[PDB]
Design an enzyme around this catalytic site. Sequence first.
Site, PDB file in Angstrom:
ATOM      1  N   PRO A   1      88.936  18.306  23.911  1.00  0.00           N
ATOM      2  CA  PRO A   1      88.701  16.876  24.137  1.00  0.00           C
ATOM      3  C   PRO A   1      89.285  16.045  22.994  1.00  0.00           C
ATOM      4  O   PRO A   1      89.029  16.337  21.822  1.00  0.00           O
ATOM      5  CB  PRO A   1      87.173  16.768  24.155  1.00  0.00           C
ATOM      6  CG  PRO A   1      86.678  17.998  23.430  1.00  0.00           C
ATOM      7  CD  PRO A   1      87.679  19.067  23.757  1.00  0.00           C
TER       8      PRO A   1
ATOM      9  N   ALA B   1      85.463  13.124  24.761  1.00  0.00           N
ATOM     10  CA  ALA B   1      84.051  12.750  24.685  1.00  0.00           C
ATOM     11  C   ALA B   1      83.773  11.544  25.571  1.00  0.00           C
ATOM     12  O   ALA B   1      84.337  10.472  25.370  1.00  0.00           O
ATOM     13  CB  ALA B   1      83.656  12.443  23.259  1.00  0.00           C
TER      14      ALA B   1
ATOM     15  N   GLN C   1      84.030  16.591  28.508  1.00  0.00           N
ATOM     16  CA  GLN C   1      83.016  16.715  27.475  1.00  0.00           C
ATOM     17  C   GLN C   1      82.126  15.485  27.532  1.00  0.00           C
ATOM     18  O   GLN C   1      82.629  14.354  27.440  1.00  0.00           O
ATOM     19  CB  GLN C   1      83.666  16.850  26.089  1.00  0.00           C
ATOM     20  CG  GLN C   1      82.652  16.916  24.964  1.00  0.00           C
ATOM     21  CD  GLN C   1      83.276  16.729  23.602  1.00  0.00           C
ATOM     22  OE1 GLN C   1      83.827  15.672  23.310  1.00  0.00           O
ATOM     23  NE2 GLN C   1      83.203  17.758  22.759  1.00  0.00           N
TER      24      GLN C   1
ATOM     25  N   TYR D   1      77.254  14.201  15.663  1.00  0.00           N
ATOM     26  CA  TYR D   1      76.693  13.272  16.639  1.00  0.00           C
ATOM     27  C   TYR D   1      75.247  13.678  16.965  1.00  0.00           C
ATOM     28  O   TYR D   1      74.677  14.517  16.274  1.00  0.00           O
ATOM     29  CB  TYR D   1      77.597  13.200  17.868  1.00  0.00           C
ATOM     30  CG  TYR D   1      79.014  12.785  17.499  1.00  0.00           C
ATOM     31  CD1 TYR D   1      79.245  11.624  16.773  1.00  0.00           C
ATOM     32  CD2 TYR D   1      80.110  13.572  17.843  1.00  0.00           C
ATOM     33  CE1 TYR D   1      80.539  11.232  16.422  1.00  0.00           C
ATOM     34  CE2 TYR D   1      81.409  13.190  17.498  1.00  0.00           C
ATOM     35  CZ  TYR D   1      81.615  12.023  16.780  1.00  0.00           C
ATOM     36  OH  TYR D   1      82.893  11.641  16.412  1.00  0.00           O
TER      37      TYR D   1
ATOM     38  N   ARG E   1      79.974  22.404  22.695  1.00  0.00           N
ATOM     39  CA  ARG E   1      80.648  22.438  21.413  1.00  0.00           C
ATOM     40  C   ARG E   1      79.570  22.298  20.356  1.00  0.00           C
ATOM     41  O   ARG E   1      78.666  21.485  20.497  1.00  0.00           O
ATOM     42  CB  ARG E   1      81.686  21.317  21.295  1.00  0.00           C
ATOM     43  CG  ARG E   1      82.730  21.604  20.222  1.00  0.00           C
ATOM     44  CD  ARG E   1      83.953  20.673  20.281  1.00  0.00           C
ATOM     45  NE  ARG E   1      85.084  21.360  19.660  1.00  0.00           N
ATOM     46  CZ  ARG E   1      86.308  20.862  19.501  1.00  0.00           C
ATOM     47  NH1 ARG E   1      86.604  19.630  19.900  1.00  0.00           N
ATOM     48  NH2 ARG E   1      87.240  21.609  18.925  1.00  0.00           N
TER      49      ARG E   1
ATOM     50  N   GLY F   1      95.233  20.811  20.009  1.00  0.00           N
ATOM     51  CA  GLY F   1      95.000  19.388  20.138  1.00  0.00           C
ATOM     52  C   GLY F   1      96.202  18.516  19.826  1.00  0.00           C
ATOM     53  O   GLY F   1      96.919  18.060  20.729  1.00  0.00           O
ATOM     54  N   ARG F   2      96.423  18.294  18.534  1.00  0.00           N
ATOM     55  CA  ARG F   2      97.422  17.341  18.071  1.00  0.00           C
ATOM     56  C   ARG F   2      98.833  17.686  18.537  1.00  0.00           C
ATOM     57  O   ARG F   2      99.638  16.789  18.787  1.00  0.00           O
ATOM     58  CB  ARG F   2      97.369  17.203  16.545  1.00  0.00           C
ATOM     59  CG  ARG F   2      96.286  16.236  16.063  1.00  0.00           C
ATOM     60  CD  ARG F   2      96.083  16.326  14.566  1.00  0.00           C
ATOM     61  NE  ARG F   2      95.559  17.636  14.184  1.00  0.00           N
ATOM     62  CZ  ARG F   2      95.074  17.925  12.981  1.00  0.00           C
ATOM     63  NH1 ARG F   2      95.045  16.992  12.039  1.00  0.00           N
ATOM     64  NH2 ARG F   2      94.614  19.145  12.727  1.00  0.00           N
TER      65      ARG F   2
HETATM   66  C1  LIG Z   1      93.021  12.111  18.847  1.00  0.00           C
HETATM   67  C2  LIG Z   1      91.845  12.998  18.572  1.00  0.00           C
HETATM   68  C3  LIG Z   1      90.624  12.730  19.171  1.00  0.00           C
HETATM   69  C4  LIG Z   1      89.636  13.694  19.187  1.00  0.00           C
HETATM   70  N1  LIG Z   1      88.476  13.476  19.897  1.00  0.00           N
HETATM   71  C5  LIG Z   1      87.525  14.481  19.993  1.00  0.00           C
HETATM   72  C6  LIG Z   1      86.487  14.365  20.909  1.00  0.00           C
HETATM   73  O1  LIG Z   1      86.487  13.443  21.730  1.00  0.00           O
HETATM   74  N2  LIG Z   1      85.577  15.406  21.043  1.00  0.00           N
HETATM   75  C7  LIG Z   1      85.650  16.501  20.199  1.00  0.00           C
HETATM   76  O2  LIG Z   1      84.764  17.357  20.221  1.00  0.00           O
HETATM   77  N3  LIG Z   1      86.689  16.609  19.298  1.00  0.00           N
HETATM   78  C8  LIG Z   1      87.696  15.659  19.287  1.00  0.00           C
HETATM   79  N4  LIG Z   1      88.789  15.823  18.458  1.00  0.00           N
HETATM   80  C9  LIG Z   1      89.009  17.142  17.760  1.00  0.00           C
HETATM   81  C10 LIG Z   1      89.950  18.010  18.595  1.00  0.00           C
HETATM   82  O3  LIG Z   1      89.307  18.383  19.806  1.00  0.00           O
HETATM   83  C11 LIG Z   1      90.386  19.264  17.824  1.00  0.00           C
HETATM   84  O4  LIG Z   1      89.256  20.026  17.478  1.00  0.00           O
HETATM   85  C12 LIG Z   1      91.166  18.894  16.555  1.00  0.00           C
HETATM   86  O5  LIG Z   1      92.249  18.058  16.894  1.00  0.00           O
HETATM   87  C13 LIG Z   1      91.691  20.145  15.828  1.00  0.00           C
HETATM   88  O6  LIG Z   1      92.652  20.805  16.637  1.00  0.00           O
HETATM   89  P1  LIG Z   1      94.244  20.607  16.372  1.00  0.00           P
HETATM   90  O7  LIG Z   1      94.593  21.099  14.987  1.00  0.00           O
HETATM   91  O8  LIG Z   1      95.027  21.387  17.400  1.00  0.00           O
HETATM   92  O9  LIG Z   1      94.574  19.142  16.478  1.00  0.00           O
HETATM   93  C14 LIG Z   1      89.773  14.845  18.422  1.00  0.00           C
HETATM   94  C15 LIG Z   1      90.975  15.088  17.755  1.00  0.00           C
HETATM   95  C16 LIG Z   1      92.004  14.157  17.819  1.00  0.00           C
HETATM   96  C17 LIG Z   1      93.302  14.413  17.096  1.00  0.00           C
END
Ligand SMILES: Cc1cc2nc3c(=O)[nH]c(=O)nc-3n(C[C@H](O)[C@H](O)[C@H](O)COP(=O)(O)O)c2cc1C
Lengths: 358, 358
Positions: A21, A55, A97, A181, A229, A323-324
């Site tokens: 998410p 989220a 989520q 949260y 999570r 994610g990113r």
């Molecule tokens: C743009 C952005 C928004 C995110 N929003 C949430 C979220 O809504 N819910 C959540 O549990 N984690 C959220 N995260 C964390 C990501 O789900 C993920 O755990 C984090 O980016 C690490 O993974 P990565 O290195 O591949 O980016 C967010 C991350 C990013 C970059």
Amino acid sequence: ALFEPYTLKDVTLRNRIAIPPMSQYMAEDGMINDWHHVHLAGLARGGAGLLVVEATAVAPEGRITPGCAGIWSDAHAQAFVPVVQAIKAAGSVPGIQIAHAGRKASANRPWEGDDHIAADDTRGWETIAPSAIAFGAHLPKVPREMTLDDIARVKQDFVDAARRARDAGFEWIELHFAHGYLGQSFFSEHSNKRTDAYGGSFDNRSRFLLETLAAVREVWPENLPLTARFGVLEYDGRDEQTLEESIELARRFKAGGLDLLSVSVGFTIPDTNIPWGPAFMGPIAERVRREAKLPVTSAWGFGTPQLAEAALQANQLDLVSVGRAHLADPHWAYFAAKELGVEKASWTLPAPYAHWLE
Amino acid sequence: ALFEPYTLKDVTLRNRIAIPPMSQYMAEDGMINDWHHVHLAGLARGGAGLLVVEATAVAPEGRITPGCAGIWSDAHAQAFVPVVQAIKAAGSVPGIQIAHAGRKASANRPWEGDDHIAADDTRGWETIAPSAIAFGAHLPKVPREMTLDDIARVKQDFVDAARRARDAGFEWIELHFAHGYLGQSFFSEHSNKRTDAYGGSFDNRSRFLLETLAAVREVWPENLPLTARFGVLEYDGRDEQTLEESIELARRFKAGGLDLLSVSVGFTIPDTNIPWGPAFMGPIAERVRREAKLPVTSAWGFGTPQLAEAALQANQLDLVSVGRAHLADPHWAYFAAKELGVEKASWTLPAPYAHWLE
Ligand SMILES: Cc1cc2nc3c(=O)[nH]c(=O)nc-3n(C[C@H](O)[C@H](O)[C@H](O)COP(=O)(O)O)c2cc1C
Ligand SMILES: Cc1cc2nc3c(=O)[nH]c(=O)nc-3n(C[C@H](O)[C@H](O)[C@H](O)COP(=O)(O)O)c2cc1C
């Protein structure tokens, strides 16, 4: 391994890539729009087996920011319907989520201050939490201590959220008990100083989360993966003790019908020392998987295809969350398929792309 | 240079990256749908200055295949309206290429045979052309020789197409006089054996194209770039002679209000020897730009950011068209911005992405 299918309950993922998410901060009054539609539909076409929608707040005050998505009415849920349908058309599994930001709520977008909204700003709102204790740092607002009726209402909000997600067509759900949260804040002794049935002991601090899981379980279909999570440690110098308790709760989650746990860090307080690094969560995720005997996923730096592959082969993870890298390239799964030498890798993408890239 | 803005008539592109028209073969009876909406909206958010929508047929028989987009009615045009609006919201300039496939029409999708549809197949249709001569090879159907009334009707079809594109909000138009379709086939002595006013001499072979340009010019706004794609040579062993004539027509296009020429190869016949290679069109495009004193773009292998940059600095091109790289990664422009060392390159993308990638 990254491109082997995965079956959980009645749901089958075409590969082990999961898009975690990722809040977009583009909603208005909880309502999503074409930003989210094109963003999610494009990601789904990218190749990933599972796409977990950002989220999505169970109640208005449960948003992180004024731009967060919500599902606290049937009209909010109905907005997701076309997007779920496009995800599915693309062959990816739609998940969502559902969340409540607790004391971290009422904040500015990350590129608009990333801090708690000023008191005189008409966009802000009172936050709620287990206890009247502020996060600190850039989030200095003291939340209101929740009443028993508040707890009943939030639990019912999660149930109403899960039911709406079910009826909108989502095939995978994720309860957001991580990242400091509400749910996470109920478990941590840092944030929970309650002296009633929802604080004090391990059983009491677990109650909100377990009760929310159980209530959601009554509306969420038994044949669709039910997941959460959860921040299993904080790197606050109490890591062995916190991890033991978190793993025990994991067992209780499993016993209570949880099919998979998305393993993260708590971010409950700011005074911590997190050892960031490529796939740094791997060993911790592996231990939770082993000691609670529960499938897991995790994230952070798995955008390197070989790292994702390594984690799977080592059985540290069952799905790899990326994610990113997907914000950078919505077609990452295709990039990974090339990197790892997959046969006919371009057919990770739909025909109007794959034909020309082979 | 790749990331310098570009102004043509009243339209300003945020950089010199252009996404050339790329048929998707996902339309039904000419009507586009969510495939096209998400595809185009996603590309626009990717960062490119200009997004030219795929070949869109002016008449049903002018489609390449049963999956090609069309704009031969107001209902077809109205389908583009939301997509144009999303392109614009994303800050990219919406363009469209309007087309008629001539003798290459009535074909299977590229991943479904890529050849002329069988005679007994209910999806097929009679093709029209300057002369009753088949392309050959995988396209063996003999087209029907066009009557003067056919020519009048097709010209009016292009006008009706341009007017619909204007009213749908497109800010950039491209006439498809390239790649062996109708317009191209009128110019080439290979395909045009006519003995009337539309064949024989240079002036006669140019007539269809010039007349179509002029007619469209009457409905297309003077303040929006009016452009065409044109195959300037065939690599058929008549390259110097064909190039001279094509450049002369370029001059006449310019004199007739053409603001930019997209320079390509003819593909009029199959018996040719094309020297494919990274940026191989550069020198030819440069010559057309120089000798007709007309801005140009071209394509083929410019997905290597340094190559795109080199072509601009050498003034071989005014915009660089990048096709397949965008099917692979819709966020290519962001990738190029990194490659070329652009300040704050992540802000090539919208905030919900850029914030996290910086
Ligand atoms: C743009 C952005 C928004 C995110 N929003 C949430 C979220 O809504 N819910 C959540 O549990 N984690 C959220 N995260 C964390 C990501 O789900 C993920 O755990 C984090 O980016 C690490 O993974 P990565 O290195 O591949 O980016 C967010 C991350 C990013 C970059
Ligand atoms: C999927 C696909 C469809 C295309 N459809 C068209 C078309 O509709 N009109 C056109 O003039 N050229 C079309 N082309 C050619 C491209 O516009 C471009 O000239 C070609 O891809 C070479 O550029 P590239 O090397 O960056 O891919 C198509 C190319 C591809 C790959």
